[PDB]
Amino acid sequence: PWHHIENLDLFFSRVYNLHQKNGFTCMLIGEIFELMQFLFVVAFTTFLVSCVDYDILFANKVTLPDAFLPAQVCSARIQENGSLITILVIAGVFWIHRLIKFIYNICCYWEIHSFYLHALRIPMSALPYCTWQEVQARIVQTQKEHQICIHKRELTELDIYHRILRFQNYMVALVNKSLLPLRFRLPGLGEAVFFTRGLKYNFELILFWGPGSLFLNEWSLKAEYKRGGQRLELAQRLSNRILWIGIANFLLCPLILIWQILYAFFSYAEVLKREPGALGARCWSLYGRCYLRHFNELEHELQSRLNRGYKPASKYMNCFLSPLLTLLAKNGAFFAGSILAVLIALTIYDEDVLAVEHVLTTVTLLGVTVTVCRSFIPDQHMVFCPEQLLRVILAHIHYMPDHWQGNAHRSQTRDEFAQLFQYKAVFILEELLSPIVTPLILIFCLRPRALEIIDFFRNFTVEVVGVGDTCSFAQ
Amino acid sequence: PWHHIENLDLFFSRVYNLHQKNGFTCMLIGEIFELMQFLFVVAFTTFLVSCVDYDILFANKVTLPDAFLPAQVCSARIQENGSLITILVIAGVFWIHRLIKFIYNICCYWEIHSFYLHALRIPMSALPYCTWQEVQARIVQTQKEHQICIHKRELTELDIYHRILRFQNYMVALVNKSLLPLRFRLPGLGEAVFFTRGLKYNFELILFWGPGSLFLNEWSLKAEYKRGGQRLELAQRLSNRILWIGIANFLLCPLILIWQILYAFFSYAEVLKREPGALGARCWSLYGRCYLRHFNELEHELQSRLNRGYKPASKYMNCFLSPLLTLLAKNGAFFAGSILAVLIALTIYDEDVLAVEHVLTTVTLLGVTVTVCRSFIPDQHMVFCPEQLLRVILAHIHYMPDHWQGNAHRSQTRDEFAQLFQYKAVFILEELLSPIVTPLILIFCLRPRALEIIDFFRNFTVEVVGVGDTCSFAQ
Amino acid sequence: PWHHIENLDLFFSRVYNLHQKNGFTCMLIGEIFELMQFLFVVAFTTFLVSCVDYDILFANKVTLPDAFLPAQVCSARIQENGSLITILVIAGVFWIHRLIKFIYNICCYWEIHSFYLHALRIPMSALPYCTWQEVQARIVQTQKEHQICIHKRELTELDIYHRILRFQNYMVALVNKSLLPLRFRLPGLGEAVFFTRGLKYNFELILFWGPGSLFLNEWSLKAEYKRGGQRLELAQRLSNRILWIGIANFLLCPLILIWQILYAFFSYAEVLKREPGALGARCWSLYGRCYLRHFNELEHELQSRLNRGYKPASKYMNCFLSPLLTLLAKNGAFFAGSILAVLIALTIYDEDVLAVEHVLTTVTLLGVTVTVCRSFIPDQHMVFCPEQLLRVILAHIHYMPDHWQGNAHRSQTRDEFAQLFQYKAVFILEELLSPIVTPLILIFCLRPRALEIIDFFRNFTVEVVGVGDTCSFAQ
Helix, strand or coil, X not given: CCCCCCCHHHHHHHHHHHHHCCCHHHHHHHXXXXXXXXXXXXXXXXXXXXXXXXXXXXXXXXXXXHCCCCXXXXXXXXXXXXXXXXXXXXXXXXXXXXHHHHHHHHHHHHHHHHHHHHHHCCCCCCCCCCCHHHHHHHHHHHHHHCCCCCCCCCCCCCXXXXXXXXXXXXXXXXXXXXXXCCEXXXXXXXXXXXXXXXXXXXXXXXXXXXXXXXXXXXXXXXXXXXXXXXXHHHHHHHHHHHHHHHHHHHHHHHHHHHHHHHHHHHHHHHHXXXXXXXXXXXXXXXXXXXXXXXXXXXXXXXXXXXXXXXXXXXXXXXXXXXHHHHHHXXXXXXXXXXXXXXXXXXXXXXXXXXXXXXXXXXXXXXXXXXXXXXXXXXXXXXXXXXXXXXXXXXXXXXXXXXXXXXXXXXXXXXXXXHHHHXXXXXXXXXXXXXXXXXXXXXXXXXXXXXXXXXXXXXXXXXXXXXXXXXXXXXX | CCCCCCCCHHHHHHHHHXXXXXXXXXXXXXXXXXXXXXXXXXXXXXXXXXXXXXXXXXXXXXXHHHCCCCHHHHXXXXXXXXXXXHHHHHHHHHXXXXXXXXXXXXXXXXXXXXXXXXHHCCCCCXXXXXXXXXXXXXXXXXXXXXXXXXXXXXXXXXXXXXXXXXXXXXXXXXXXXXXXXXXXXXXXXXXXXXCCHHHHHHHHHHHCCCCCCCECCCCCECHHHHCCCCHHHHXXXXXXXXXXXXXXXXXXXXXXXXXXXXHHHHHHHHHHHHCCCHHHXXXXXHHHHCCCCCCCCCHHHHHHHHHHXXXXXXXXXXXXXXXXXXXXXXXXXXXXXXXXXXXXXHHHHCCCCECECCHHHHHHHHHHHHHHHHHHXXXXXXXXXXXXXXXXXXXXXXXXXXXXXXXXXXXXXXXXXXXCCCEHHHHHHHHHCHHHHHHHHHHHCCHHHHHHHHHHHHHCCEEECCCEEECCCCC | CCCCCCCCXXXXXXXXXXXXXXXXXXHHHHHHHHHHHHHHHHHHHHHHHHCCCHHHHHCCCCCHHHCCCCHHHHHHHHHCCHHHXXXXXXXXXXXXXHHHHHHHHXXXXXXXXXXXXXXXXXXXXXXXXXXXXXXXXXXXXXXXHCCCCCCCCCCCCCHHHHHHHHHHHHHHHXXXXXXXXXXXXXCCCXXXXXXXXXXXXXXXXXXXXXXXXXXXXXXXXXXXXXXXXXXXXXXXXXXXXXXXXXXXXXXXXXXXXXXXXXXXXXXXXXXXXXXXXXXXXXXXXXXXXXXXXXXXXXXXHHHHHHHHCCHHHHHHHCCCCCHHHHHHHHHHHHHHHHHHHHHHHHXXXXXXXXCCCCHHHHHHHHHHHHHHHHHHCCCCCCCCCHHHHHHHHHHHHCCXXXXXXXXXXCHHHHHHXXXXXXXXXXXXXXXXXXXXHHHHHHHHCCHHHHHHHHHHHHHCCEEECCCEEECCCCC
16 A cells, blocks of 8 residues: 555556455465466376376276386486476476466565555455445545555546556557458468467567567657657567567477467366367457457456357357258258167067167167257257347447448358357367467568557557556557 | 240249259259158168068077068069059159159259349359348349340239249138138037148149149139139039049048158157157147238248247147146145155154055155145246237237137137147147048038139139239238 | 125125135135144144154054054043143134134125126136236126125225225335334344244234224224324323233243144155255245335235246345355366366276276266366356346336445345345244244334334324225325
8 A cells, every 4th residue: 555666557457456366365376276287287297107007007906006106216217208307397497487476476465455455445355246346436535645656646547447458458459450460361261360378478578578578667668669760670670579589489389389288188178078069169269359359448347248248149150050951950860760760669569679789779879860960950940140139249249340230141241250259169279279370470470560560659659647658549 | 034934933933942942952952852751761661561571580699681581582572462562653653753843843943043143143152141032122123134024014023922822822812711621520529620731732733733723824714714604514513623633532542641651650750759748849730820821921921920929829828827726736745745754754763664564655655746746836936927928929920819819818719729839749640630531521521612612713813914813812 | 796794895805815716616625725734733743742653663564553553542642641632622722713714704705706606797717817907897897786885985996905905004004114123133143124924913913903903893993093192091001902912922832833833844844855955945025025015005916026026036146156166166177177087088098997996986076076166167158247137126026225226236235135035944944933032022122112103003094985094105
């Protein structure tokens, strides 16, 4: 609750994060769980690779620990692996860096916790329900009695928004004005959109937070980028910077692939064995979280809009079905149900046609076939592909391509609403492919745009008196 | 798209059908599947009857083809069956007639496909979503460039409706004015309605398309039927025509009965073994598809109205109270749950409840009793809308009996609202009974009405300038 | 159908009750069942205690009637119990009083039947179905022919409402103006509300129907209560009356506690046995039925409003959930699904991973763990605005505290919206506690309010020309 002591963007961001992860205790536990998941993936994997004797486990009454090798031997068997030891050393260095960041992260969050309790007066018990609007009302009312900020200017409730969302408004405006290569023309497919978690991380590491970024303070743009002249040397410097960051990505490719290959397999293989159709459900597409997002919109407001409008969008995506597939389903159901009805009447009649060594199995198969076809056979209604279903999905999100409103029922509309709707299997595939795809897009497709990026940041960056250097659109 | 290359109706109907079966390819496949279903039913049945050695299959490790007899013997075993060979010859003649009609139909449908692509400019890809609306308005614009009709004003298409629906408006007006015997007074039941697929086929074969029908052209009524005189000789001729068509039906009775047998088996017996309650769901009743029809209404508009209004109608069939029972359920649940609670508290206390000769059986029977009663006990706070149910169903249908609106809750209303919405099982039964019932209704109940049918077709048949001879009501 | 034979209330109320219990035959049967439930509870209550030899039943093949003792001995064993014989004599006297009231009631309900059939012309078959408005539309039109009572007033169309609901409007206005102690401040809990069936019965027995009540006729207030003077002696007399009625309650406490014990114990426990979560569902309360009730509102209109608005209220009560647990669920699901995915991949790979010392149990326990966690994981995309919903509950219930509309999401709102909506189990507990709690509230908390009760009944009691003495608010 101190008198404007440390850079603001961070203080406010931390305050917001503490409100989101409902309370200090919850947040601390969440971070600890995040650290234990990494360590568990890595240690479980290195235990499966190195310590388990699969041959004895498989064939050659056996108790579970009959497989495992004693530690006095596991250490030697894992140590005589140069590749494994190297991956483990890099993994442990990343881990130690994350644990050290966590330490302070909590040493700096105890300060926000005391801020809440003593200056805002919202106990951690009343915080999951304290709500954002009131807190906003609390912080802005607190600004007076207790000194905070320069005091040159009193808070105005949009300052806090700019502080929390400075770099995110920049991402919104970058993606909105078609910088930042996302569209690609793949052979054998339409124009794909490839925007992942790692790619946006790299874009922010290149532009916003790094050793030689565009920003020096986290609230002020470096002095040269405001100058009209020397734009070409700045463009060359940015191009070289992004070249070398792309090369670091290309060199780290195997390790992130491993983790990506690994964590992912673990994450959904359970779900696959349970309900293989959970991966057929659709999610709201990182490109699409950035496209449908307003300028000064905190994460919880975007997500509230995005799930208020989720079931209309699933009703839309499921409303168009192939007639042909429908006809094939109907007739395959007829022929399979006919052969099965005959075989069922026989097994009912005598019961020794049952479990024909061949028949029983087919009966099931044929049963699987009839069930699949009946699932593909449409049932009555839901065929609208309506202007109206779109007319509600839009009412939620509020943005649509302008060539969508008329032809809501075509393959052009579905195909590029498809890109926003993101069925998950692809997400998981698209997050797997990002280790190997992000360096080459970063080296080839973005380096030509560096001279346009420089002109964006020079042209669209306003200095607002209290907040510093913010995007020009987010005003 | 040759100008006046044909009478308007056999062209417009085909165009409409091509829009419905979404595209030429789809339609072709659908027809092929329709031809393969007939051939499969007949060949599978004759294989089951004639080639399989059931004794070895049942009792006397055995592979499946150990049952089947070699073809060199199947041919002789199926050939030495006069009844089977005769049924197969009649079946093959009907099949060959259907295959020849199919070849002629696709040779005539390639012309409609070229019509679409070249004169309407709707590719087969944009046709499942082109929409009827698009083409119906569009052709009317084509009427200028690619001319049709020797002397044609741009098609209002109001007329075009007339072309597609000439004979169907006649059926609607026949059933609407209570010609065409449908109501019957069966002993042991109320007034049944018996209107099937075969019966309406026979009515149309008698009245509209045949060797000596009422119509000579498909768009013009024969010249004598417009004359007021000679009505009695025309009535006698129509009566003799329908007598002999009924006798042809009576002679073909065994074959159509056999057909309705096997197709259903395969079609339904599978569904019975899977979900015996799927046949308890209700369907919209061929009488009822003709009763709830609306002026000049293409099939897809009727079906859209009919399924928009399907779930309200199931909630209605579902809704009525049976109140006195409710009380019996409540109080039987009380007394049974009381005795069971005592016996349960005892078996929990000591666990030596058993050895009583009937105890355990008493607990099980009492549990069944409580569960049945609780199923009959209405759920509290379950809303009831008799007025609404007999209101929203009408809003979707738009036609109502004048004695339904007041007493929505009586057995008179349910009993005759049932016929319109009758359940699938009585549908399958009523389609089974039509081979044996259609000839006798056709001979006995319709031949007395021939003099009224003649007066209908003389009185209600207007000559509209562009379309020809249409029903007088459908104007 | 005669003229003014009985008090209008004693006629109109009966007419309304006959419409509610749909018909005379129903009403009778319901009353008979009500009489048989009392006698059945008391019977075994006494057969289980007195005639059954539990020792032989438990331990010392045995048929059920091997336990029971012969009647020649049951009579002596139940007769040599002074406490049991005394409870049975009091129970039999209450029963005989109820049976005599039942005979008198059906002898008076036949008259009413005849009223329906002959003067209203609504047969008992068309009654469950008559609908309320129609009777209203029938009785008021009948007032001309079979003249109604005095016939002083033609039907008011409100008069019937006042007649049926005279004392209930008084209860509504008493509870509405915070007479009638309901709120209590218990230690260890918030302000509890204790309003039961027995408490409201006692309030009505004290105020409305008794030997020395406020009312002498059932439609006229005693003459002294209209006088401004002598208010203090009337207050003292009312205080003494309620003191002695409270003392009668305190003396009858053991018997009502037992009966409350017996009648309740039997019913609910079995249900809990079946589904222990049925008692976690919530019901509207005697209170809350009196708080949310309009003035001249018949019981069926209140209950229609109350169940139209029941599911919104359950959605509200279930909306608040722990942030912390969620996190535990998510991460336990991760770790369990990870170990299970590994073990599943192994059992798929070789199939002999199974049959290992812990193999056929770890997979099952881990599957249960993942399923439990996934049930605790909230559905992502799940939209709950607690604040928004209360709006629909209000649209149905129609009454609310002012300080709810803003803070719909707080514990203050839930805590006192809890009182209106409390779950069954506290209902059954609160009906159990009323025998022992009603006398002390009646003696201590209401006797101080007697001088305010007298001033209420003097100030708010209007004489309306046709109906007599009605509450002043219910106008």
